[PDB]
Design a binder for this molecule. Structure first.
Ligand SMILES: N[C@@H](CCC(=O)N[C@@H](CS)C(=O)NCC(=O)O)C(=O)O
Ligand SMILES: N[C@@H](CCC(=O)N[C@@H](CS)C(=O)NCC(=O)O)C(=O)O
Lengths: 219, 220
């Protein structure tokens, strides 16, 4: 009976996407803190587990999986007692995959990580307008995802919603979501806030926001 | 036949083209010229509001994102799963490497620089954009260990994803074969595939487009 181990810290958006998924699956697991501020991802012990020095990492028995999106797909496929969260139908799965690849690059790499690195790590107090533009571009794209639908990848909650909420709920540290401009995006956030296990995201999202607010900058 | 929307110079388009060739799946190819802003036409925006390529239409289905498209293609049309294994541990590694490509390689290192130079008319590139490329090469060199592919001992769609972007990044930073012997050997391995010209043709066009827009790098 495998109980997996998750490595991470709650402030990290992709770690929170995996925390939401584990909670949705009601799957017990051990959680090991990798304090990124203590540069703990660069330890010799952790670099053996993950040469990319990133979190989250999941150890599942003898398996070692990095990347929140790979981890979430793996978790649902192995332990999911239905497949609503990651449907087996190929066209619907492709939409969930598409939305997670979108989160990986357009949201996380291009908008979030870039700006967070500048502010939280490099101590910059001025950032170019393009870093703010990356954020509003992401919001604009996600607003358009909804159409006549409730969630980012269909009419059911999927791991793509967990992926995208983890980062969008972090980006609001930099640019709050204008509810008038983004009504569908705002409603979707409100909907997810009502999940019984949403604190697996909101606690760390609030920590991320607090860390960002303590490092002011101009543009 | 499936329909693929793209242009050969685009890296993620070329990852899909490689996949289609590997699968021997005939398709209609519709060229969307990005330099002429054809992705912003009323008709293309209807098909894909993100105005991106590649886009695949298959019957009444629509799939965007090269990595989503490739996984779908192998799972739907592959005669076996070698290019995208059904085993969950093996699949997770392929997924991991494609997610890595999408963010660390494509969004962070390639698209950033290419948009600046090719589309936005900038000639001054911060040293940070060059650092983002060498970081990527360092990460990929480390994937191999004793294996010959990025996601295990057999060719997978993760190889097609990473070669499409790495073969474009050399426009900016040629791969030092002394520093990156495994990455170099892997490129040479893929170059042997009978259908590799589905990547090399457009990669050369990408390189040519970059050489036509001279730039300098700024920063210690
Ligand atoms: N998109 C990747 C992101 C992984 C990532 O970059 N995690 C950051 C924390 S938000 C990290 O580990 N930074 C530590 C480092 O790069 O050294 C995923 O979904 O897992
Ligand atoms: N994550 C996507 C990237 C798609 C993408 O950014 N495509 C570029 C071409 S390299 C594009 O369509 N640019 C046109 C635009 O954004 O308007 C994938 O793997 O397919």
């Amino acid at each position: 009976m495998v109980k997996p181990i998750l490595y991470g810290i709650d402030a990290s958006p992709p770690v929170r996407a995996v925390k939401l998924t584990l909670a949705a699956l009601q799957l017990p697991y051990d959680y090991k803190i990798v304090n990124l501020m203590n540069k703990e991802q660069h330890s010799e012990e952790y670099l053996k587990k993950n040469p990319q020095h990133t979190v989250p990492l999941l150890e599942d028995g003898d398996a070692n999986i990095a990347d929140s999106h790979a981890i979430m797909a793996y978790l649902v496929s192995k332990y999911g007692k239905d497949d609503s969260l990651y449907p087996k139908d190929l066209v619907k799965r492709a939409l969930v995959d598409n939305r997670m690849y979108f989160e990986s690059g357009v949201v996380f790499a291009n908008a979030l990580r870039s700006l967070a690195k500048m502010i939280l790590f490099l101590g910059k107090t001025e950032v170019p307008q393009e870093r703010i533009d990356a954020i509003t571009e992401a919001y604009d794209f996600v607003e358009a995802f909804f159409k006549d639908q409730t969630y980012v990848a269909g009419n059911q909650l999927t791991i793509a919603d967990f992926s995208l909420i983890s980062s969008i709920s972090s980006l609001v540290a930099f640019v709050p979501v204008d509810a008038a401009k983004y009504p569908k995006l705002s409603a979707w956030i409100k909907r997810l806030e009502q999940l019984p296990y949403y604190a697996e995201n909101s606690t760390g999202a609030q920590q991320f926001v607090a860390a960002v607010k303590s490092k002011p900058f101009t543009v």
